[PDB]
Amino acid sequence: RRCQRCLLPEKLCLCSTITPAQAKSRFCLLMFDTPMKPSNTGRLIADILPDTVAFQWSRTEPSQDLLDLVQNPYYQPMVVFPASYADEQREVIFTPPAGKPPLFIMLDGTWPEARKMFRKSPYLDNLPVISVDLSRLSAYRLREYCTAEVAIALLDMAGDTGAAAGLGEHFTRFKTRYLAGKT
Amino acid sequence: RRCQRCLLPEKLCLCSTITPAQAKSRFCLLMFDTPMKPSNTGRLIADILPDTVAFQWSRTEPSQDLLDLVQNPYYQPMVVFPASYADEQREVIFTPPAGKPPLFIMLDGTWPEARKMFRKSPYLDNLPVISVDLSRLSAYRLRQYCTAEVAIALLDMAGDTGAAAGLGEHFTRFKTRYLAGKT
Numbered sequence: 001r002r003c004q005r006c007l008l009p010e011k012l013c014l015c016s017t018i019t020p021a022q023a024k025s026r027f028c029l030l031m032f033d034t035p036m037k038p039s040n041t042g043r044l045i046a047d048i049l050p051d052t053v054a055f056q057w058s059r060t061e062p063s064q065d066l067l068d069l070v071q072n073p074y075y076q077p078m079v080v081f082p083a084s085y086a087d088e089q090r091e092v093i094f095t096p097p098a099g100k101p102p103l104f105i106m107l108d109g110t111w112p113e114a115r116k117m118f119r120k121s122p123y124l125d126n127l128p129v130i131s132v133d134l135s136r137l138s139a140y141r142l143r144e145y146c147t148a149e150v151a152i153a154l155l156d157m158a159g160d161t162g163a164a165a166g167l168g169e170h171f172t173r174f175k176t177r178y179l180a181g182k183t
Numbered sequence: 184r185r186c187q188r189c190l191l192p193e194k195l196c197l198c199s200t201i202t203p204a205q206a207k208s209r210f211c212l213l214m215f216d217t218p219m220k221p222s223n224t225g226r227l228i229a230d231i232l233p234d235t236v237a238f239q240w241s242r243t244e245p246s247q248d249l250l251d252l253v254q255n256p257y258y259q260p261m262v263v264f265p266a267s268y269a270d271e272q273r274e275v276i277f278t279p280p281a282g283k284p285p286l287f288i289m290l291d292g293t294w295p296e297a298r299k300m301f302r303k304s305p306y307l308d309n310l311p312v313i314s315v316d317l318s319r320l321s322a323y324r325l326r327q328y329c330t331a332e333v334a335i336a337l338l339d340m341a342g343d344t345g346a347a348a349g350l351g352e353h354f355t356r357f358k359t360r361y362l363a364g365k366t
């Protein structure tokens with residue numbers, strides 16, 4: 001009864017609407033649970049930006065491919081999480097750094113899952129935390145938050161406004177259809 | 184706060200999505216009530232086919248512009264109503280006639296309002312009733328029935344598949360947003 005790709009009821013399937021975009025930014029999804037939950041919105045990022053990398057998160061045996069990706073000096077990697085959680089010695093930044101393309105590492109799940117991922121992933125500890133400027137959502141007619149909404153604001157912070165606008169529109173489509181599914 | 188044109192919550196406003204189409208068929212809406220109610224779907228026809236004529240229905244004082252339109256020999260006028268309610272001497276048909284462009288007269292309101300309009304409008308009595316083949320909605324991945332849904336079937340019956348597809352997509356957008364605004 002539910003689409004296996006877009007996770008909405010079948011009469012509400014949005015797959016035909018999806019128009020991927022392009023961006024200088026790149027996302028990496030560390031997923032606490034890979035089945036796939038409609039309430040987890042990190043997957044919407046991958047619909048709009050299909051170069052999004054996604055992993056199942058592990059407490060003790062992180063993937064070598066994940067380690068390779070976050071250690072690739074081609075990118076500037078950063079952990080996406082509210083600044084108040086970062087240690088006093090943790091580097092916190094407020095814009096993507098200039099030059100190398102950013103790799104936005106999202107902790108995709110619930111808060112206690114996100115928080116657990118933030119604290120028990122030592123391969124992320126030497127990375128800067130970016131504090132997202134959520135007020136930028138106003139320029140996309142979204143409430144100035146879902147993991148997909150955080151990503152929209154990040155894309156806008158990086159000047160990837162085409163992908164921000166495409167993800168906003170895709171997010172609103174999913175959220176509207178989801179609510180309707182509950183009706 | 185609701186949009187005054189598309190009658191949805193302001194955050195769910197659909198006006199920007201509307202792309203009118205073109206059709207050989209033409210519609211005429213006799214609306215019981217012209218505030219407008221969100222759940223009256225005759226107005227969705229006008230969004231897709233802006234040459235749709237619309238009048239306020241009156242029992243005793245029909246507009247002369249309405250009388251003039253239905254007496255225009257340029258069109259083949261017909262009243263859109265379930266065939267079971269026609270009189271035995273009423274000409275019932277099952278396809279739009281061939282040759283002159285069809286003028287589909289919709290009774291836009293609720294069922295008791297439509298049935299009242301059907302019975303108390305002497306200017307429509309010498310007109311044929313077209314019985315709508317609603318199984319055609321299957322071709323548009325749709326399935327009582329909204330006035331806008333009946334119009335999609337009529338458009339398809341007349342070969343106006345582009346307008347029928349555009350009205351289907353529009354009706355589903357309205358219906359999905361209306362359900363979500365209800366959530």
Ligand SMILES: Nc1ncnc2c1ncn2[C@@H]1O[C@H](C[C@@H](N)CC[C@H](N)C(=O)O)[C@@H](O)[C@H]1O
Nearest residue numbers: 040041080081082107109111114145146147150
């Ligand atoms: N200020 C913020 N900075 C960074 N990420 C944020 C912020 N506020 C919310 N988030 C995101 O929201 C997640 C936690 C929950 N809100 C997730 C809700 C829901 N499961 C979703 O996927 O949208 C975090 O792991 C981040 O992805």
Ligand SMILES: Nc1ncnc2c1ncn2[C@@H]1O[C@H](C[C@@H](N)CC[C@H](N)C(=O)O)[C@@H](O)[C@H]1O
Nearest residue numbers: 223224263264265290292293297315328329330
């Ligand atoms: N079998 C049918 N043949 C012709 N018109 C129909 C048929 N079934 C429904 N309709 C039309 O669709 C309306 C259905 C009503 N329930 C109105 C629902 C709602 N108020 C709307 O405006 O969409 C009728 O009043 C007619 O205008």
Ligand SMILES: [Zn+2]
Nearest residue numbers: 003006013015
């Ligand atoms: Zn789907």
Ligand SMILES: [Zn+2]
Nearest residue numbers: 186189196198
């Ligand atoms: Zn509107």
